[PDB]
Design a protein around this nucleic acid. Structure first.
Lengths: 1092, 49
DNA sequence: GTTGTGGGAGCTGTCACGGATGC
DNA sequence: GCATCCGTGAGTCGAGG
RNA sequence: CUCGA
């Protein structure tokens, strides 16, 4: 009973027992609505009219109003910007990806210049730059790569009070801090890293009367600030006055926030100096401890210390606002030169275009999108990756805290996160607690505060009027729970109800005391987390791991929706934006492996091009396939084609495998996994991986490289797959080592070997003298050449300086599941494949059906994730189908929930939502009435177990084993990517040690702790060898190779080059270091074989 | 109360029950896990500690 | 050769410790 | 006579771009 | 920068 809203969406029967009173909002709205505010689109106009005041202003309109008008110091001239308009887009998205461009639109504005003494008003339309644009999917394209702007967590402007304890006698010491929208701050009156500031030396009070302060008049407090914060200059009477007037009263310097001003006026008074008086009164009357406070003109404020992690005092700046702030920076940097040109030039001859240099705004936008920590390479292993990435909230970055100045209380789950930031989905590693994901139903508001929806309660009556509350508004109310008994008409059945109050604590209050109720369970969860069946049965560690590992599934050649899922797979796949969706209801007029054309009813034609075998940012294969047939009538929103990890419109991150839970000969020891070789023969876990090799011919000192099929002394047979250009041919199968693009690089004459010198002399060779710098395929890689793209400087192809030609070979490979690959269930139950057994010796059921995967029993109980077991049971139920016996009534176990679950055909699609859905009793009931197989044999008994035969000896295993169907994902951690060895390779020019990294054919690092270990063994010679002739001895290593090749003993080791380099660095530090003999001076460091 | 439910659990469980066999034999895991799985997790810590 | 008006970005949610310095 | 202010520590090994 | 043990 789910997915009824989405047309054509398959029928996934749901065990849920609660009505869904609110659908999932646009799971990308967090990004879109933000950008649509920034731009001022009609969408945002209507959305603000529906839930906002009558005077809306977009991000750019606001920036312009703030900047206007650029005025001369004498007030003689004034420049005013207005009416931000966009042209159409320069190039489409796929075009920008192909050409390595930046999807953007030209920005235009009306610039009105006025000379106050000539009356001349020359209006003009000025162009501000190529403003980068947000795509349908909510991303950006910069330099041809797709990027996401992750929302940032930061402290909203305002004043905040806290209560510390002094090291004197544990006295309760109050402190305050004022965080501004822009400018400096202060504390208590210490200001700008200058302590020892009496609060009374700058202007019933308990200690305000005690201030100690010795002065009278206004010049003392005016001169003390210039003598205490503006040093390096004598004490003056005018400069201190000027600075004090330009500190906080001045609006140019000190930017009073809008959100900040709202928060502060809510903290002190409905309607600056008033604020400072209220703040002093607040600190005083907080040192006392009184409940409320009365300020002149303001009233009704609770005297209380503020929580720094509360979501009513912690906001997030969406993409729109980050862009707005970068634009403000560029605009101020431009206004500087605008005034600086107003000064010099003559009036009546300066047009808006003459004094407006946009270079700083362009550079600001560019630097933001290209260097900000919040513009991130889009995680697109699969649709769920990108969907969560867009909805993500991180606290690091410019303007937030530091990855090292962020302690542990920052990373703690605050009670105000309920329904706003999911508490499960967060990284396990260093970034833990710092990167969360937006809750499913959550929604950002104009001020950057995360609101969440609740059903209104009128006289213990759950209504259908929904209301969105922020953390503050919520705290001030009593929120019922979603799984609260309610009779029709919205009436709590129980005398009282469980609820949450402001203290972050729960209570059991009479029904007439409830204000709002949760819209649904799982309201606190994120999208990924909401997709773990039987979540409540899993510990938070393994559940966090399950979410994180769902975001790592690799798309498989053929995708299969989970036999048992939540209700979120469909909506997740759709919002993610990797499936094609019918924008307008019509009739399929044509369908091909290439495109899909629908004829709308009003005669309109719309066509959709299928992404076919597209490489993703992480090598996964984005490949769409249509799921409509010619003549099919499709409604608006219906899914037209499946994406990479989707099936009929549902997130299909893995496959349904026949699992047996039992230790099998140790091959699944200590988390290993055993797979049936079927999964290889039938490609059940096979995936496609597309890599992009690139190579350019550029200008060198000795000339210019040339991409040529003619490479020095290469066998005609080796080039057999190269075209005339020296580029491999499409569809060619390339093993590791083959050539991909031939290239020669001008070589100097001094480098020619003596052999080559004589060869070019005797045979009268030419003066080419090049080196083979051709692009070869790296180790552990192979595949068919999917594609070839090429860019020539000859043609009108734009490339960097000195780069003549540039070719890119796109190579695909089909990876079969293999030993070493990493699989995992949705319950944080990960493991590498220990062995892939022949189907014949796999344990099999009575009917010869061999299991597909053997999961070691010893791994389940201690991890506290029996969720996988419940899933196995329900999955077998769904794979066999069932029929609850209704004759003589409906059994009590199936009475509560089951409505259309009383029977189900084999391979039925069922969803068990989190915190609702399948109950243990109902699971057991279904397990009792399993349907039989072909021969009318019930294979899995009422415990969920079944006898199995040892496919090796033939004898049956003595005890029944739990067999079932489990959803297993192929996580993007594959041996093919991680195997790496090296005998000898490139070294670093600085340390002369082996390069690091597989991509560079590097060597393993023998770290300090490894040398400790080696010493503990007493393996002196092994440690020396590892550290001298394998790393740094520039002659020792070549000697070692020469000795191995000629069957001679390994020579004695020399001197690590890194030591010479250390000596050189010391010397450069003016330290005279010197190596000495037993009794001698400093030792110094620094043909016949060739002639032979 | 947590210790009492753990005791009742250990009593009710037959000693050949696999979840008991795996813990008692010393193979892997403690009985606190058996108690939080069936029975009750008990008290959970605070953000403070 | 420079001749009318003129203070910038940055922390900025870490902690626990030991010993010059500086009033 | 010492109280602050500063300057030093704060796990290892791996992968992309 | 993100991620793996």
């Amino acid at each position: 009973s789910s997915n009824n809203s989405v047309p054509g969406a398959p029928n996934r029967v749901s065990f849920a027992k609660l009505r869904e009173p609110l659908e999932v909002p646009g799971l990308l709205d967090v990004q879109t609505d933000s950008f649509e505010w920034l731009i001022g689109s009609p969408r945002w106009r209507e959305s603000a009219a529906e839930r906002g005041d009558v005077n809306p202003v977009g991000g750019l309109e606001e920036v312009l109003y703030e900047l206007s008008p650029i005025e001369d110091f004498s007030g003689s001239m004034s420049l005013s910007f207005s009416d931000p308009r966009f042209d159409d887009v320069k190039a489409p998205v796929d075009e920008c990806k192909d050409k390595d461009m930046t999807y953007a639109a030209p920005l235009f504005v009306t610039a009105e210049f006025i000379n106050n003494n000539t009356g001349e008003i020359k209006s003009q339309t000025v162009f501000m730059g190529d403003f980068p644009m947000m795509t349908e999917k909510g991303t950006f394209i910069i330099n041809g790569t797709e990027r996401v702007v992750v929302s940032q967590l930061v402290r909203s402007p305002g004043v905040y009070f806290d209560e510390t304890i002094d090291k004197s006698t544990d006295k309760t010491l109050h402190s305050v801090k004022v965080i501004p929208s822009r400018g400096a701050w202060l504390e208590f009156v210490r200001i700008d890293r200058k302590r020892r500031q009496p609060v009374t030396v700058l202007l019933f009070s308990e200690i305000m009367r005690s201030t100690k302060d010795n002065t009278v008049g206004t010049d003392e407090a005016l001169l003390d600030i210039y003598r205490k914060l503006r040093p390096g200059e004598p004490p003056t009477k005018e400069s201190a006055q000027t600075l004090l007037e330009n500190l906080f009263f001045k609006e140019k310097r000190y930017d009073l926030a809008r959100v900040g001003r709202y928060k502060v006026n809510k903290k002190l008074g409905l309607h600056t100096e008033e604020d400072v008086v209220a703040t002093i009164e607040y600190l005083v009357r907080l040192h006392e401890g009184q409940t409320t406070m009365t300020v002149p003109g303001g009233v009704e404020v609770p005297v209380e210390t503020d929580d720094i992690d509360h979501f009513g005092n912690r906001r997030l700046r969406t993409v729109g606002e980050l862009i707005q702030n970068q634009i403000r920076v560029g605009m101020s940097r431009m206004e500087r030169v605008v005034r600086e040109r107003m000064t010099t030039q003559d009036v009546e001859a300066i047009t808006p275009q003459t004094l407006i240099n946009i270079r700083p705004v362009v550079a600001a936008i560019k630097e933001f999108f290209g260097t900000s920590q919040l513009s991130q390479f889009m995680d697109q292993n699969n649709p769920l990756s990108g969907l969560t990435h867009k909805r993500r909230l991180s606290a690091l970055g410019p303007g937030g805290l530091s990855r090292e100045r962020a302690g542990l209380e920052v990373r703690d789950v605050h009670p105000s996160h309920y329904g706003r930031m999911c508490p499960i989905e967060t990284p396990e590693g260093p970034n833990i607690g710092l990167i969360g994901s937006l809750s499913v139903y959550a929604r950002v508001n104009p001020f950057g505060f995360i609101e969440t929806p609740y059903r209104k309660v009128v006289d213990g009556v759950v209504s259908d009027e929904i209301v969105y509350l922020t953390a503050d508004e919520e705290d001030r109310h009593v929120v019922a729970q979603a799984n609260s008994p309610i009779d029709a008409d919205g009436r709590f059945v129980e005398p009282r109800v469980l609820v949450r109050r402001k203290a972050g604590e729960v209570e059991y209050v009479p029904s007439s005391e409830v204000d709002y109720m949760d819209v649904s369970p799982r309201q606190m969860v994120s999208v990924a987390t909401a997709m773990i069946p039987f979540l409540e049965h899993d510990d938070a560690n393994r559940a966090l791991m399950g979410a994180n590992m769902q975001r790592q599934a690799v798309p498989l050649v053929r995708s299969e929706a989970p036999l048992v899922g939540t209700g979120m797979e469909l909506r997740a796949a759709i919002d993610a934006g990797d499936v094609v969706v019918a924008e307008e209801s019509g009739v399929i007029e044509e369908v091909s492996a290439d495109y899909i054309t629908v004829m709308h009813d009003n005669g309109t034609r719309r066509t959709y091009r299928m992404r076919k075998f597209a490489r993703s940012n992480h090598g996964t294969c984005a490949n769409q396939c249509p799921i409509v047939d010619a003549g099919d009538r499709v409604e608006a929103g219906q899914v037209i084609a499946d994406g990479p990890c989707t099936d009929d419109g549902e997130m299909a991150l893995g496959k349904n495998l026949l699992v047996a839970i039992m230790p099998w000969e140790g091959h699944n020891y200590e988390d290993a996994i055993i797979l049936s070789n079927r999964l290889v023969e039938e490609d059940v876990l096979t995936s496609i991986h597309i890599e992009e090799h690139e190579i350019d011919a550029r200008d060198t000192k000795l000339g210019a490289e040339e991409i040529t099929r003619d490479i020095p002394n290469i066998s005609d047979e080796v080039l057999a797959d190269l075209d005339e250009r020296g580029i491999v041919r499409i569809g060619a199968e390339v093993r590791d080592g083959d050539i991909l693009v031939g290239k020669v690089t001008p070589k100097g004459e001094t480098e020619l070997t003596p052999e080559e010198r004589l060869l070019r002399a005797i045979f009268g060779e030419k003066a080419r003298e090049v080196r083979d710098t051709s692009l070869k395929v790296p180790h552990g890689e192979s595949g068919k050449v999917i594609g070839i793209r090429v860019f020539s400087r000859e043609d009108e192809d734009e490339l960097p300086a000195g780069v003549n030609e540039l070719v890119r070979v796109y190579v695909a490979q089909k990876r079969k599941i293999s030993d070493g690959d990493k699989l995992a269930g949705r319950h944080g139950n990960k493991g590498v494949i220990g062995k892939i057994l022949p189907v014949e010796d796999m344990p099999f059921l009575a009917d010869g059906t061999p299991v597909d995967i053997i999961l070691n029993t010893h791994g389940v109980p201690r991890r506290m994730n029996i969720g996988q077991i419940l899933e196995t049971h329900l999955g077998w139920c769904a794979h066999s189908g069932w029929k609850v016996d209704a004759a003589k009534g409906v059994p009590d176990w199936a009475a509560r929930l089951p409505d259309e679950l009383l029977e189900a055909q084999p391979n039925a699609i069922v969803s068990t939502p989190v915190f609702d859905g399948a109950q243990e009793a109902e699971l057991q009931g279904l397990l009792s009435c399993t349907l039989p197989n072909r021969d009318g044999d019930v294979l899995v008994d009422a415990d969920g177990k079944a006898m199995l035969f040892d496919g090796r000896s033939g004898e049956p295993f003595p005890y029944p084993v739990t067999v079932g169907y489990m959803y297993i994902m192929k996580l993007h951690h594959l041996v093919d990517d991680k195997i790496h060895a090296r005998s000898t390779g490139p070294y670093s020019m600085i340390t002369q040690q082996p390069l690091g990294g597989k991509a560079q054919f590097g060597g393993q690092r023998f770290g300090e702790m490894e040398c400790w270990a080696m010493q503990a063994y007493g393996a002196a010679y092994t440690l020396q060898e590892l550290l001298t002739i394998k790393s740094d001895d520039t002659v020792g290593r070549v000697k070692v190779y020469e000795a191995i090749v000629k069957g001679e003993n390994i020579p004695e080791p020399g001197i690590p080059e890194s030591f010479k380099v250390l000596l050189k660095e010391l010397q450069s530090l003016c330290l005279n270091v010197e190596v000495l003999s037993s009794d001698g001076a400093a030792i110094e460091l620094r043909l016949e074989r060739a002639a032979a | 109360a947590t210790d009492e439910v753990g005791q009742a659990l250990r009593e009710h469980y037959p000693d050949d029950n696999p979840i008991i066999t795996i813990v008692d034999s010393g193979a892997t895991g403690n009985f606190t896990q058996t108690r939080t799985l069936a029975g009750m997790k008990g008290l959970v810590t605070n953000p403070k500690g």
